[PDB]
Amino acid sequence: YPVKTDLHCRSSPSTSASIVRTYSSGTEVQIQCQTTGTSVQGSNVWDKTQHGCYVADYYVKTGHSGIFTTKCGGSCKPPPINAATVALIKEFEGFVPKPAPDPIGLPTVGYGHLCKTKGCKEVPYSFPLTQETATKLLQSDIKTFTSCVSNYVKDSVKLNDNQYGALASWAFNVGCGNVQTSSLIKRLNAGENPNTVAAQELPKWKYAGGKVMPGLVRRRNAEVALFKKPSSVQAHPPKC
Ligand SMILES: [K+]
């Protein structure tokens, strides 16, 4: 069932409970079970979703007002990437304020955003982009990659925000399928010291067309330096 608005998914069926994640308008939810809690726009019905958190049923488009399924009788979103990670991706992707005017093939904008159309009008920000809107665009794009990193790395392997951000930057560059089959993920999951794994594995990802690319050597070195940058903030597994 689609949510009718940006809808908070809470740890209990209560507007006072902590927010586990927020579903954007139109996102599909599957209802495990329903319960009663805080009245929202005249309905006290709350739905437990596929993520194990609770949403106000008023904002889920089901065709029902009352409880219609099992009575009851979460999983934190990966965090946004930090400032240092954004700065690294901007260094290596550059900044493009507007799409090339009449492009051959699909253009880029912002910080390495590949457009789906030549006009790129499906991007939800006005052209030209500013540093602010390029960053928001990047935070949206990077969700694919923080999601797959956080999926493939075991939850017993704690990564700080710099480590997580470095992997997100790598993943964005190489794609999730490559992350999944990487020795990097394998060695992290075997319990090897993360900084050692990163330092040894990331520099291997330097080849294009059988040829070592200086730009990739440079990027992997910057990703290694970010990975090893000390932090006491845990990013993986997510906390909420
Ligand atoms: K995981």
Numbering used by the authors: 1 to 73, 79 to 245
Task: Give sentences copied directly from the paper behind this entry.
Muramidases are N-acetylmuramide glycanhydrolases which cleave the β-1,4-glycosidic bond between N-acetylmuramic acid (NAM) and N-acetylglucosamine (NAG) in the carbohydrate backbone of the bacterial cell-wall peptidoglycan. Here, the identification, characterization and X-ray structure of a novel fungal GH24 muramidase from Trichophaea saccata is first described, in which an SH3-like cell-wall-binding domain (CWBD) was identified by structure comparison in addition to its catalytic domain.
The linker, G73-SSSGGG-S80, appears to be flexible: its electron density is ill defined and it was not initially obvious how to assign the domains which compose a monomer. This was resolved by inspection of the surface, which strongly suggested a likely choice of connectivity for the domain pairs. While it is possible that the relative positions of the two domains is flexible in solution and that this particular orientation is a result of the crystal packing, we note that the linker is relatively short in this enzyme. The overall fold of the T. saccata catalytic GH24 domain follows that of the homologous GH24 enzymes.
